[PDB]
Motif scaffolding. Structure first.
Motif, PDB file in Angstrom:
ATOM      1  N   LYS A  63       0.811  -1.201   0.000  1.00 26.23           N
ATOM      2  CA  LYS A  63       0.000   0.000   0.000  1.00 26.23           C
ATOM      3  C   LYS A  63       0.847   1.254   0.000  1.00 26.23           C
ATOM      4  O   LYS A  63       0.367   2.310  -0.421  1.00 26.23           O
ATOM      5  CB  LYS A  63      -0.932   0.029   1.211  1.00 26.23           C
ATOM      6  N   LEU A  92       1.120   1.938  -3.602  1.00 31.19           N
ATOM      7  CA  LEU A  92      -0.102   2.428  -4.223  1.00 31.19           C
ATOM      8  C   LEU A  92      -0.450   3.835  -3.768  1.00 31.19           C
ATOM      9  O   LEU A  92      -0.985   4.620  -4.557  1.00 31.19           O
ATOM     10  CB  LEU A  92      -1.258   1.479  -3.928  1.00 31.19           C
ATOM     11  N   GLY A  93      -0.162   4.169  -2.519  1.00 26.41           N
ATOM     12  CA  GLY A  93      -0.417   5.507  -2.036  1.00 26.41           C
ATOM     13  C   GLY A  93      -1.323   5.532  -0.829  1.00 26.41           C
ATOM     14  O   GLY A  93      -1.452   4.539  -0.114  1.00 26.41           O
ATOM     15  N   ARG A 139      -4.611   7.711  -0.969  1.00 30.87           N
ATOM     16  CA  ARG A 139      -5.954   7.827  -1.515  1.00 30.87           C
ATOM     17  C   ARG A 139      -6.174   6.918  -2.709  1.00 30.87           C
ATOM     18  O   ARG A 139      -6.872   7.303  -3.650  1.00 30.87           O
ATOM     19  CB  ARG A 139      -6.259   9.268  -1.908  1.00 30.87           C
ATOM     20  N   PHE A 140      -5.570   5.755  -2.722  1.00 28.83           N
ATOM     21  CA  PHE A 140      -5.972   4.874  -3.798  1.00 28.83           C
ATOM     22  C   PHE A 140      -7.320   4.252  -3.456  1.00 28.83           C
ATOM     23  O   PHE A 140      -7.644   4.077  -2.284  1.00 28.83           O
ATOM     24  CB  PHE A 140      -4.917   3.801  -4.054  1.00 28.83           C
ATOM     25  N   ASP A 145      -7.506  -2.200  -4.977  1.00 32.07           N
ATOM     26  CA  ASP A 145      -6.569  -2.795  -5.910  1.00 32.07           C
ATOM     27  C   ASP A 145      -7.263  -3.347  -7.137  1.00 32.07           C
ATOM     28  O   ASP A 145      -6.738  -3.227  -8.241  1.00 32.07           O
ATOM     29  CB  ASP A 145      -5.771  -3.908  -5.243  1.00 32.07           C
ATOM     30  N   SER A 163      -7.769   1.125   1.255  1.00 29.36           N
ATOM     31  CA  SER A 163      -6.655   1.996   1.572  1.00 29.36           C
ATOM     32  C   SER A 163      -6.776   2.526   2.987  1.00 29.36           C
ATOM     33  O   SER A 163      -7.811   2.411   3.633  1.00 29.36           O
ATOM     34  CB  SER A 163      -6.598   3.175   0.623  1.00 29.36           C
ATOM     35  N   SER A 206     -14.048  10.602  -9.409  1.00 28.56           N
ATOM     36  CA  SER A 206     -13.262   9.419  -9.117  1.00 28.56           C
ATOM     37  C   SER A 206     -13.877   8.671  -7.943  1.00 28.56           C
ATOM     38  O   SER A 206     -14.840   9.120  -7.324  1.00 28.56           O
ATOM     39  CB  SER A 206     -11.817   9.790  -8.815  1.00 28.56           C
ATOM     40  N   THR A 233     -12.517   7.632  -4.896  1.00 29.49           N
ATOM     41  CA  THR A 233     -12.271   8.220  -3.588  1.00 29.49           C
ATOM     42  C   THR A 233     -12.955   9.563  -3.440  1.00 29.49           C
ATOM     43  O   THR A 233     -13.379   9.918  -2.337  1.00 29.49           O
ATOM     44  CB  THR A 233     -10.787   8.375  -3.352  1.00 29.49           C
TER      45      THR A 233
END
Ligand code: CLA
Ligand code: CLA
Ligand code: CLA
Ligand code: CLA
Ligand code: CLA
Ligand code: CLA
Ligand code: CLA
Ligand SMILES: CCCCCCCCCCCCCCCC(=O)OC[C@H](COP(=O)(O)OC[C@@H](O)CO)OC(=O)CCCCCCCCCCCCCCC
Ligand SMILES: CC1=C(/C=C/C(C)=C/C=C/C(C)=C/C=C/C=C(C)/C=C/C=C(C)/C=C/C2=C[C@H](C)[C@H](O)CC2(C)C)C(C)(C)C[C@@H](O)C1
Ligand SMILES: CC1=C(/C=C/C(C)=C/C=C/C(C)=C/C=C/C=C(C)/C=C/C=C(C)/C=C/C2=C[C@H](C)[C@H](O)CC2(C)C)C(C)(C)C[C@@H](O)C1
Ligand SMILES: CC1=C(C/C=C(\C)CCC[C@H](C)CCC[C@H](C)CCCC(C)C)C(=O)c2ccccc2C1=O
Lengths: 83, 38, 59, 741, 170, 175
Positions: free
Chosen positions: D555, D558-559, D561-562, D565, D576, D709, D711
Motif C-alpha cells: 500500500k 499504491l499511495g 488515496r488509492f 486494488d 486503503s 473518481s 475516492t
C-alpha cells in the motif's frame, strides 16, 4: 524476560510505613493513611456482607492504598533495572 | 496584468456572475415582492 | 519580612543554597546559568516550602 | 544549537501564477483534458508534503498557511464582536439575562424571512444566539457596545497582522528548516509564552476587569453606574471597597503573605447562586495556577544555555525490555514529518475539545450560562463534534505518516514498529472488544425492547427489573460529594453540582442538579465505550494496515488515496488507509450522535427545567429517562418523536428556519447515499450517454466531462452524510430547546 | 586577570569602552555588549536626568500647579493620573522609532557605538582620540554613579519617613 | 548614514523629496515597495490640507442657511444636519466617481512604476507651473510638508474637544 523476580514484601514496608506515621488529620483518616484502613478491615473481615458505597474508610482506602502499592511494586521491578 | 486572468477563471467569474444574478433576484424581490402574476 | 531572627528570608536563603548545591551536581559547571538556573530552582523549592510551612503548621 | 536562519525575498509576490491554476503540482500543470483535473486541483491544493519532497519549501508553505487560518479566525472573532456591537441586544441583555433571550443576527427583510426575527425582548428582534457569546462577554466584563466595536476593530487589526504575517513569512522573509526543527524552543515558547503568558495575562484581565465588574453585576447594578474597567486601575479605591486586599498592594505578594489575597483569589468551586456560573475569584486563581504551573513547565527544554532536556535524551532513556529498543527514533520521526505531528496534535486537540464539552455542562463557567439552556446545550454539542472530527484526522494523519513519510531505516526495532509486528494481535482484540461491547451494550437494548414488548417487564433491565446500577460511577461520584471537607481540604463547595449537594436555582431555572446514574445511564456508557472502540478499531486498522497488509502487501507503493486494488483477491474495494478514515467518519457520526442524544435527553429529565415555590422540581421531560432509556421504543418515542414536537410545529413562527434546516438536512443526508451506494462505472457512461446529447448539438465541453473518481465519489458521500446528518441534529436541538429555554 | 576582580580572567575586550572589564557573573558571555552597553548608557541617562530631576524636585521656578506633591510616591500618585501619562507617551513614541532601531539594529549586527549619535553643540569630539573615549568612560562612570545615587535618594526617604533629600542634612 | 538620524543608510529610498532628509525609522519601506506608500502619502496630504482649510474656513462663520456650528465635529448637528438635508450623499458620491474613475487606473499607474505617484496633471498656472527639475521638486516638497503639517495640525484641530467643547477660534480666546 522477568530476570529478577526477587522480592515483593520490601514494597509493603515501603508503602505502609511511609503512610502510617503521617497522620494529616482533617481528611477521612484522623489517624494515618494506613491505620485508617487496617483498623477498618478487621471490623469487616469476619464474613460481613456490609460495606456499601458510603463506606468511606474501606472503599476509599482500597483504591488510594492499592494505587500507590501497585506503583511502588512496579517501581520495585524498576528496582531491578539497575541489574 | 495577470490579475484579470485570475478574475477570468471559472469560480471567480461564476461568483461575480451568480452574485450578480442573485443580486438581480434579491434586488428585484425587494422592489417587487410577492410576484405571482406575469 | 523582618531581619535575621527567624522569618521568611531565613528559610529562603537555605533553599537557595541547597538549590545551588544541586546546580553543583546537575551539570555542575561554574558558569552564570548555574546561578540563574539553580538559584531559581532553590527559589521554587523555597516558595514551595514557605507557604507549605505556613498553611499546615507554624512558620 | 539555536539560531534564527531566515531566507529573505524568496518567492515573488506577482499575480502571475494565479493565471496558472494547478501551478503547484508538476503532475497537475498539464491542463485539464478531463474534469477530474478540476477536483484534483483541490485535493492536491494542500498536499504540501506531496508537491515537492524538499521539507524546507513545504515547511515554509505550511507555516505561512497557518497565518491564513488565524487571519480567518480573527476575521471571524471580529465578526462576533461586531455583530455583538451593531446588531445585538447585548446591552439590553445585560439588564436582565434570565428574561431576554440572546440574539445578534437581525435578518434582512425580504420575502417572509423577516418572520425569522424572533422577538427575544430587549426592544429589538432577530434570530436567537445559541453560541453563548454574551455569557463569555459578561464574564469578560464588556459593559457597553464601545468595547465590542473596539475589540472588533482590534480583531480586524490582528487579521491584518496575520495576512501581512503569512505574506511576510512565505515571500520576503521565510525561514530555513533549521528554524523549524528547533523543537525544544518551540515547546519552550508554547508551554511558557503562548499558554503561560496567556493564562497569566488573562488572570490580569480577570482580576483587574472581571472581578470588580462581575462583583458589581453580582450586586445587580445596571451598566450605567458601573465605571469603566479602565477606571478600576487608575485608583485602587474603587477596588479596595470591592476587595480590601487591593489596599495592601503587591507587598503581601512579595513577602509571600498570600493569605492576604483570599479576597481576590480563592478555592471555592461550586457555582455562584446569583449568576449561575463559576466564581470568578476561583477562575482568576485558576489561571494563576495555570500561569505559574505552565511557566514552570516551559523551562524543561535545553536550547542554548546548557540547562534543560532535549527530547532525544529523554526518549532514548526509556529503553524498556518489552519494547527492546525503546523510543529510539521518535525524535527523528516527529521532527521530519508533519503528518505525524498532525496526528498527535489533532488527537489531543479533539480530545481536549471533548473535555471542554464535559467541563462546560457540568461546571458552567460563564455567568447566566446554565440559565439559558440552548447556549448550555450547544456549547456542549459543538465542542463534541470538532471534538470528534479532530480525532479522525489523527486516524487520517497517523495513516499518512505510515504511508508517505514512514522509513524503516530510522524506525527499526523501536516502540513504533514493534506494534506493527503484532498488529494482528492489536486489531484482533479491538475486534473482540467491539463485539463484546456490542452485544453487551446493544443486546441489552434489544433485550429490554423485547421484554417490554413481550409484556414481561419484570425481565427487563429497568430500575425495578434486573438492575445494572453503575457501581463505580456512583462510588467515585460519592467521593466527589465528599470532596470539599475531606480531601480538597481548603475547598468550600464541591467540584461541581453534577456530583454532590442540592441543586442551584437561578431565576426559577435549574443551573445544575446532582445527576443520578442508574441502570440506564450504565448501558448508554457501554454504548459510548462500544462506539469509541469501533472508531478505534477502524482508525487503528487504518494505521497498522496503512502500509503493508497481508491482503495487499504494497500500500506504500499504491499511495494513501488509492481506491482499491481491483476485483482480485475476490475484490479489494475500499482498502486503503484513506478508506478506514472514510469509515471512521460515519462511526464518528454514530458515536457522537449518541453522545449528544445521551446528553440532551438525560439532561432534560435529570437536570434542566424550572422550579416552583417550596423547592419543587420540574424537569423539561419530567424525569422520563430511566424508565425510557432502557428500550429503543422508549428511546425513539420518548426522545426522537416527542422532542420533535417543537421542531415540527415550528412553521409560521420564528423557529421555522430550523424547520427548514430539519427537512433539507434530511435531504442532504439521503443525498449522500447516491454517492455512497452507486459507483462511477455507472455514472461515467450515464454521463457519456449525455455527452452524446451534447455532441449532437455541438455543445461538447472542451474539458471532457468525466464522472467523479472513486475516492472523491465516496468522500462526497461522507461529506454530505455529515452535513446532512449533523445539521438534522443541529436544527432539532436548537429548535427544541429555544422553544423551552 | 582584569584589574578589578579576583584572579579570574575575562574573555571580553571587544570595543565596549570603560576598560576595566568587570565581569564576575559573565553575563557578557551570554548576551552581546552592544545591547547591554546601550543599556548601561541608557540607564545611565535616566540616572543623570532623574537625579537632577530630584535635585530640581524641590527647587526654584516651577510650572506652578503644585505645592502638596513634593514627595516621590506622592508624585507617582498625583501626576501619573493626568500630568505624566504623556511623560510616558512622548518618550514611548520616541522609543518605538528611536530605541527600537537602535538596540535592534546593533544586536542585529550593525557597526555603531551604542550612544545613538546625536545632538552635540559641545564636547571636544573633533579629535578621534582617547578624549572621545575619555568622555565615554566619564559618561558611564557618571551614569552608574548617578544610578547608585538613585538608590541613595530612594532609600534616603523610605527608611527616613518619606522626606526630602537636601533637607536631610538640615 | 545617508539618513540625518540615528542609523539606516538608504534602506530603499534616498532620492525622494525629503529636503531635510529621508526619515523612515520603522520597517515599512523594508517590505512595502514604497510606491504604494508614496501614493498614500500624497493622497492623504491633499485630503488633509482640504480638511484643515475646511475647519478653519468654516470657523470663519459661513452658512447658506443652517444652525450655529459651535464645533466642526461631533456628528448630529453639523454632520447630520447635513445628511438629513440629503446633501452630503452627493458630495461623497462625486468622490466615489473620482477615485474609482480617475484614481483607480491612476493607482494602476502606481502599480507598474510609471507615474511619479502624485500627478493628476493639473497645473492651471502661468509663470510658476514648472513640470521640470527645480520648482517641481521644491514645490512638491511644499505640498508634502504643508500636507504633513495639515495631517498633524488637523489632528490637533480634531482633538481640542475634551477641555474645550468650543471652536478653535474660541481656543485662541483661551490662554
Ligand atoms: C450585484 C447585484 C446588485 C444589483 C444589480 C443592484 C442594483 C441596485 N441596487 Mg443594490 N445592493 C447589492 C447588489 C446589487 N444591487 C448588494 C449586494 C447590496 C448590499 C450592500 C445592495 C444594497 C443596496 C442599497 C442599500 C440600495 C441598493 C439600490 C439599488 C438600485 C439602484 C438603482 C439598483 C436596482 C438602491 C435602491 O434603489 O433602493 C431603494 C439602495 O438604496 N442596493
Ligand atoms: C424550480 C422551481 C421553482 C419555481 C418555478 C419557482 C417560482 C416562483 N417562486 Mg420560488 N422557490 C423555489 C423554487 C421555485 N420557485 C425554491 C426551491 C425555493 C427555496 C429556495 C423558492 C423560494 C421562493 C421565495 C422565497 C419566493 C419564491 C417566489 C417565486 C415566484 C416568483 C419568483 C420571483 O422572484 O419573481 C421575481 C423575479 C423576476 C421578476 C426576475 C425575472 C426578470 C428577468 C430575469 C429579466 C429579463 C427578462 C427578459 C415564482 C412563482 C416568490 C413569491 O412571491 O412566491 C410566489 C418568493 O417570494 N420562491
Ligand atoms: C518540606 C516542606 C514542605 C511542607 C511542610 C509542605 C506542605 C504542604 N504543601 Mg508543599 N512543597 C514543598 C515543600 C513543602 N510543602 C516543596 C519543596 C515544593 C516544590 C516547590 C512544594 C510544592 C507544593 C505544591 C505544588 C503544592 C503543595 C501543597 C502543600 C500543602 C498540602 C499538601 C497536600 O495536598 O497533601 C501542605 C501545606 C499543595 C497545597 O494545597 O498548598 C497549600 C500544593 O498544591 N506543595
Ligand atoms: C513566546 C513566543 C511565542 C508565541 C506567543 C507563539 C504563538 C504562536 N505560535 Mg509560535 N513559535 C515561537 C514562539 C512563539 N509562538 C518560536 C520561538 C518558534 C520557533 C521554534 C515558533 C514556531 C511556531 C510554528 C512553527 C507555528 C507556531 C504557531 C503559533 C500560533 C499557534 C496558534 C494559536 O495558539 O493561536 C492563538 C493566537 C494568538 C495567541 C495570537 C498571538 C499573536 C501575537 C501577536 C503574539 C505573536 C508573537 C510573535 C512571535 C512576535 C514576532 C516577533 C517578530 C516581530 C520579531 C501562536 C500564535 C503556529 C501557527 O499557527 O503559526 C502562526 C505554527 O504553525 N509557532
Ligand atoms: C444498524 C446497522 C448496523 C449494525 C447492527 C452494525 C453492527 C456492527 N458493525 Mg457496523 N456499520 C454499519 C451499520 C451497522 N453495523 C454501517 C452503516 C457502516 C457504514 C460505515 C458500518 C461499518 C462498520 C465497520 C467499518 C465495522 C463495523 C463493525 C460492526 C460490528 C461491531 C461489533 C458488535 O457490535 O457486535 C455486536 C453485534 C450487534 C450489536 C448486532 C446485534 C446483535 C444482537 C445484539 C444479538 C444477535 C441477535 C440474534 C440473537 C441473532 C440470532 C437469531 C437469528 C439467527 C435468527 C457490529 C456487528 C465492525 C466489525 O466488523 O467488527 C467488529 C467494523 O469494523 N461496522
Ligand atoms: C447480548 C446481550 C444480552 C444479554 C446479556 C442478555 C441476557 C439475558 N437475556 Mg436476552 N436477548 C438479547 C440479548 C441479551 N440478553 C437479544 C439481543 C435478544 C433478542 C434477539 C434477547 C432475547 C431474549 C429473550 C426472548 C429472553 C432473554 C432472556 C435473557 C436472560 C436469560 C438468558 C440466559 O439464560 O442467559 C444465557 C447465558 C448463558 C448460556 C451463559 C453464557 C454467558 C457466560 C456468562 C459467559 C461467561 C464467559 C466467561 C466470563 C469467560 C471467562 C472465564 C474463563 C476464562 C474461565 C438474560 C438476562 C430471557 C429472560 O426471561 O430474561 C430474564 C428470555 O426469555 N433474552
Ligand atoms: C554627566 C552627564 C553627561 C555626559 C558626560 C555625557 C557625555 C556624552 N554624551 Mg550624553 N546625555 C546626558 C548626559 C551626559 N552625556 C543626558 C542627561 C542625556 C539625556 C538628554 C544625554 C543624551 C545623549 C545623547 C542622545 C547622545 C549623548 C552623547 C554623548 C557623548 C558625546 C556628546 C558630548 O560631547 O557630550 C557632552 C556632555 C556634556 C558636556 C555634559 C553636559 C553637562 C558624550 C560621551 C552622544 C553619543 O553617545 O554619541 C556620540 C549622543 O548621541 N548624550
Ligand atoms: C492501562 C493498563 C494496561 C496494562 C498494560 C501493561 C503495560 O503497560 O506494561 C508495560 C509494557 C511495556 O513494557 P516495557 O518495560 O517495554 O515498557 C517500557 C517501554 O514501554 C517504554 O520505553 O507495555 C506492554 O507490554 C503493553 C502490553 C499490552 C497489554 C494489553 C492491555 C492493554 C490494553 C487494555 C487496556 C485496559 C484498560 C483497563 C482499564 C481498567
Ligand atoms: C469628525 C469626524 C470623525 C473624526 C475623525 C478624526 C478627525 C480622524 C482623524 C484623526 C487624525 C487626524 C488624528 C491624528 C493625530 C496625529 C497623532 C496624534 C500624532 C501626531 C504627531 C506625530 C506625527 C509625532 C510627531 C513627532 C513630533 C516631534 C516633536 C518630533 O518633531 C518628531 C515627530 C515629527 C515624529 C468622527 C468619527 C469623530 C465623527 C464623524 O462624524 C466626523
Ligand atoms: C495647488 C493646486 C490648486 C490649490 C488647491 C488648494 C486651494 C491649495 C491650498 C492648500 C492649503 C489648504 C494647504 C494647507 C496647509 C496646512 C494648514 C495651513 C495648517 C495650518 C496649521 C498651522 C497654522 C498650525 C496650527 C496650530 C494647530 C494646533 C492644533 C493649535 O490649535 C494651535 C495652532 C492653530 C497654532 C490651485 C487650483 C489653486 C492651483 C493649481 O495649480 C494647483
Ligand atoms: C451523481 C454521481 C456522480 C456525478 C456527479 C457529477 C459529475 C458532478 C455534478 C456536480 C458538478 C459540480 C456540476 C458541474 C456544474 C459546474 C459547476 C458549472 C455550472 C454553473 C454554475 C453552477 C457555476 C459521480 O461522478 C459519482 C462518482 C462516483 C460515485 C458516485 C457518483 C455519483 O453518485
Amino acid at each position: 524476560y522477568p530476570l529478577n523476580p526477587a522480592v515483593i514484601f520490601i514494597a509493603l514496608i515501603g508503602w505502609s510505613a511511609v503512610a502510617a506515621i503521617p497522620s494529616n488529620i482533617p481528611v477521612l483518616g484522623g489517624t494515618g493513611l494506613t491505620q485508617a484502613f487496617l483498623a477498618s478491615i478487621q471490623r469487616l473481615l469476619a464474613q460481613y456482607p456490609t460495606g456499601p458505597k458510603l463506606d468511606d474508610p474501606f472503599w476509599f482506602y482500597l483504591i488510594v492504598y492499592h494505587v500507590g502499592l501497585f506503583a511502588l511494586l512496579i517501581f520495585g521491578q524498576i528496582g531491578y533495572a539497575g541489574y | 496584468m495577470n490579475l484579470k486572468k485570475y478574475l477570468s477563471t471559472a469560480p471567480v467569474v461564476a461568483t461575480l456572475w451568480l452574485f450578480l444574478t442573485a443580486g438581480i433576484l434579491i434586488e428585484l424581490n425587494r422592489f417587487f415582492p410577492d410576484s405571482l402574476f406575469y | 519580612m523582618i531581619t535575621i531572627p527567624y522569618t521568611i528570608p531565613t528559610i529562603m536563603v537555605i533553599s537557595n543554597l541547597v538549590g545551588v548545591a544541586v546546580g553543583r551536581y546537575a551539570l555542575g559547571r561554574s558558569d552564570l546559568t548555574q546561578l540563574i538556573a539553580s538559584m531559581c530552582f532553590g527559589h521554587i523549592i523555597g516558595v514551595g516550602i514557605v507557604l507549605g510551612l505556613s498553611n499546615m503548621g507554624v512558620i | 544549537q539555536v539560531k534564527v536562519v531566515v531566507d529573505r525575498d524568496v518567492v515573488p509576490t506577482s499575480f502571475e501564477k494565479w493565471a496558472k491554476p494547478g501551478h503547484f503540482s508538476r503532475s497537475l500543470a498539464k491542463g485539464p483534458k478531463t474534469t477530474t483535473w478540476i477536483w484534483n486541483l483541490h485535493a492536491d491544493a494542500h498536499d504540501f508534503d506531496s508537491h515537492t519532497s524538499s521539507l524546507e519549501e513545504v515547511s515554509r508553505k505550511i507555516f505561512s498557511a497557518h497565518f491564513g487560518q488565524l487571519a480567518i479566525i480573527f476575521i471571524w472573532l471580529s465578526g462576533m464582536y461586531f455583530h455583538g456591537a451593531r446588531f445585538s441586544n447585548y446591552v439590553a441583555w445585560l439588564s436582565n439575562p434570565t428574561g431576554i433571550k440572546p440574539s445578534a443576527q437581525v435578518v434582512w427583510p425580504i420575502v417572509g424571512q423577516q418572520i425569522l426575527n424572533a422577538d427575544v425582548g430587549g426592544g429589538m428582534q432577530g434570530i436567537q444566539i445559541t453560541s453563548g457569546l454574551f455569557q463569555l462577554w459578561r464574564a469578560s466584563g464588556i459593559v457597553n457596545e464601545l468595547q465590542l466595536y473596539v475589540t472588533a476593530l482590534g480583531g480586524l487589526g490582528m487579521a491584518g497582522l496575520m495576512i501581512f504575517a503569512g505574506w511576510f513569512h512565505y515571500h520576503k522573509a521565510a525561514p530555513k528548516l533549521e528554524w523549524f526543527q528547533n523543537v525544544e524552543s518551540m515547546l519552550n515558547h508554547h508551554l511558557a509564552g503562548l499558554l503561560g503568558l496567556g493564562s497569566l495575562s488573562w488572570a490580569g484581565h480577570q482580576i483587574h476587569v472581571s472581578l470588580p465588574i462581575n462583583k458589581l453585576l453580582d450586586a445587580g447594578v445596571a451598566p450605567s453606574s458601573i465605571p469603566l474597567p479602565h477606571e478600576f486601575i487608575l485608583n485602587r479605591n474603587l477596588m479596595a471597597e470591592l476587595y480590601p486586599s487591593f489596599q495592601q498592594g503587591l507587598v503581601p505578594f512579595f513577602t509571600l503573605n498570600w493569605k492576604q489575597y483570599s479576597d481576590i483569589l480563592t478555592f471555592k468551586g461550586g457555582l455562584s447562586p446569583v449568576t449561575g456560573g463559576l466564581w470568578l475569584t476561583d477562575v482568576a486563581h485558576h489561571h494563576l495556577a495555570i500561569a505559574v504551573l505552565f511557566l514552570v513547565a516551559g523551562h524543561m527544554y535545553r536550547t542554548n544555555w546548557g540547562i534543560g532536556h532535549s527530547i532525544k535524551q529523554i526518549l532514548e532513556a526509556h529503553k524498556g525490555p518489552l519494547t527492546g529498543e525503546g523510543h529510539k527514533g521518535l525524535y527523528e520521526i516527529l521532527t521530519t514529518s508533519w503528518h505525524a505531528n498532525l496526528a498527535i496534535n489533532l488527537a489531543m486537540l479533539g480530545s481536549l475539545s471533548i473535555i471542554v464539552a464535559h467541563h462546560m455542562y457540568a461546571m458552567p463557567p460563564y455567568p447566566y450560562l446554565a440559565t439559558d439552556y440552548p447556549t448550555q446545550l450547544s456549547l456542549f454539542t459543538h465542542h463534541m463534534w470538532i471534538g470528534g472530527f479532530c480525532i479522525v484526522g489523527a486516524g487520517a494523519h497517523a495513516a499518512i505518516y505510515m504511508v508517505r513519510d514512514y522509513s524503516p531505516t530510522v524506525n527499526f526495532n523501536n516502540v513504533l514498529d514493534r506494534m506493527i509486528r503484532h498488529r494482528d494481535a492489536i486489531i484482533s482484540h479491538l475486534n473482540w472488544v467491539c463485539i463484546f461491547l456490542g452485544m453487551h451494550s446493544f443486546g441489552l437494548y434489544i433485550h429490554n425492547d423485547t421484554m417490554r414488548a413481550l409484556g414481561r417487564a419484570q425481565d427487563m433491565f429497568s430500575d425495578t427489573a434486573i438492575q445494572l446500577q453503575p457501581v463505580f460511577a456512583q462510588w467515585i461520584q460519592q467521593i466527589h460529594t465528599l470532596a470539599p471537607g475531606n480531601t480538597a481540604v481548603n475547598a468550600l463547595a464541591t467540584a461541581s453540582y453534577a456530583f454532590g449537594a442540592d441543586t442551584v436555582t437561578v431565576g426559577s431555572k435549574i443551573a445544575m442538579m446532582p445527576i443520578k446514574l442508574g441502570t440506564a445511564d450504565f448501558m448508554v456508557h457501554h454504548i459510548h465505550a462500544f462506539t469509541i472502540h469501533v472508531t478505534t478499531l477502524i482508525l487503528l486498522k487504518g494505521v497498522l494496515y496503512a502500509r503493508n497488509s497481508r491482503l495487499i502487501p504494497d500500500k506504500a507503493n499504491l499511495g494513501f488515496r488509492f481506491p482499491c486494488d481491483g476485483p482480485g483477491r475476490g475484490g479489494t474495494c475500499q482498502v486503503s488507509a484513506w478508506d478506514h478514515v472514510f469509515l471512521g467518519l460515519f462511526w464518528m457520526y454514530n458515536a457522537l450522535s449518541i453522545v449528544i442524544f445521551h446528553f440532551s435527553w438525560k439532561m432534560q429529565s435529570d437536570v434542566w427545567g424550572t422550579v416552583t415555590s417550596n423547592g419543587a422540581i420540574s424537569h423539561i421531560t419530567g424525569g422520563n429517562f430511566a424508565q425510557s432509556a432502557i428500550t429503543i421504543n422508549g428511546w425513539l418515542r420518548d426522545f426522537l418523536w416527542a422532542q420533535a414536537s417543537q421542531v415540527i410545529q415550528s412553521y409560521g413562527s420564528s423557529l421555522s428556519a430550523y424547520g427548514l434546516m430539519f427537512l433539507g438536512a434530511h435531504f442532504v443526508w439521503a443525498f449522500s447515499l447516491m454517492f455512497l451506494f452507486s459507483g462511477r462505472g455507472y455514472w461515467q457512461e450515464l454521463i457519456e450517454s449525455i455527452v452524446w446529447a451534447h455532441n449532437k448539438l455541438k455543445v461538447a465541453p472542451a474539458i471532457a466531462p468525466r464522472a467523479l473518481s472513486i475516492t472523491q465519489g465516496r468522500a462526497v458521500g461522507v461529506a454530505h452524510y455529515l452535513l446532512g446528518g449533523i445539521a438534522t441534529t443541529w436544527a432539532f436541538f436548537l429548535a427544541r430547546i429555544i422553544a423551552v429555554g | 586577570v582584569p584589574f578589578a576582580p579576583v584572579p579570574e580572567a575575562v574573555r571580553e575586550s571587544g570595543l565596549a569602552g570603560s576598560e576595566a572589564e568587570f565581569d564576575p557573573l559573565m553575563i557578557t558571555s551570554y548576551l552581546p555588549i552592544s545591547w547591554m552597553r546601550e543599556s548601561e548608557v541608557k540607564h545611565g541617562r535616566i540616572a543623570m536626568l532623574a537625579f537632577v530631576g530630584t535635585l530640581a524636585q524641590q527647587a526654584y521656578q516651577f510650572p506652578w500647579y503644585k505645592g502638596a506633591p513634593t514627595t516621590l510616591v506622592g508624585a507617582h500618585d498625583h501626576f501619573v493620573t493626568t500630568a505624566l501619562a504623556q511623560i510616558l507617551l512622548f518618550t514611548s513614541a520616541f522609543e518605538i522609532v528611536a530605541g527600537v532601531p537602535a538596540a535592534i539594529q546593533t544586536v542585529r549586527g550593525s557597526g555603531r557605538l551604542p550612544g545613538y549619535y546625536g545632538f552635540d553643540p559641545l564636547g571636544l569630539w573633533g579629535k578621534d582620540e582617547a578624549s572621545r573615549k575619555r568622555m565615554e568612560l566619564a559618561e558611564v562612570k557618571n551614569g552608574r554613579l548617578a544610578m547608585i545615587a538613585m538608590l541613595a535618594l530612594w532609600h534616603q526617604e523610605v527608611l527616613s519617613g518619606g522626606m526630602g533629600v537636601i533637607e536631610q542634612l538640615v | 548614514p545617508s539618513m540625518p538620524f540615528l542609523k539606516r543608510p538608504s534602506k530603499l529610498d534616498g532620492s525622494l523629496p525629503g529636503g531635510e532628509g529621508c526619515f523612515d525609522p520603522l520597517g515599512f519601506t523594508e517590505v512595502f515597495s514604497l510606491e504604494w506608500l508614496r501614493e498614500a502619502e500624497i493622497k492623504h496630504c491633499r485630503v488633509a490640507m482640504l480638511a484643515v482649510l475646511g475647519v478653519i474656513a468654516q470657523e470663519f462663520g459661513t452658512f447658506d442657511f443652517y444652525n450655529a456650528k459651535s464645533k466642526l465635529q461631533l456628528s448630529p448637528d453639523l454632520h447630520n444636519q447635513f445628511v438629513q438635508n440629503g446633501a452630503l450623499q452627493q458630495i461623497l458620491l462625486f468622490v466615489c466617481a473620482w477615485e474609482f474613475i480617475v484614481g483607480l487606473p491612476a493607482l494602476i499607474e502606481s502599480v507598474n512604476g510609471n507615474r511619479e505617484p502624485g500627478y493628476f496633471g493639473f497645473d492651471p498656472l502661468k509663470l510658476g507651473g514648472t513640470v521640470g527639475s527645480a520648482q517641481w521638486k521644491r514645490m512638491q516638497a511644499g505640498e508634502l510638508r504643508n500636507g504633513r503639517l495639515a495631517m498633524i495640525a488637523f489632528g490637533g484641530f480634531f482633538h481640542q474637544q475634551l477641555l474645550t467643547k468650543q471652536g478653535i477660534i474660541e481656543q485662541l480666546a483661551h490662554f
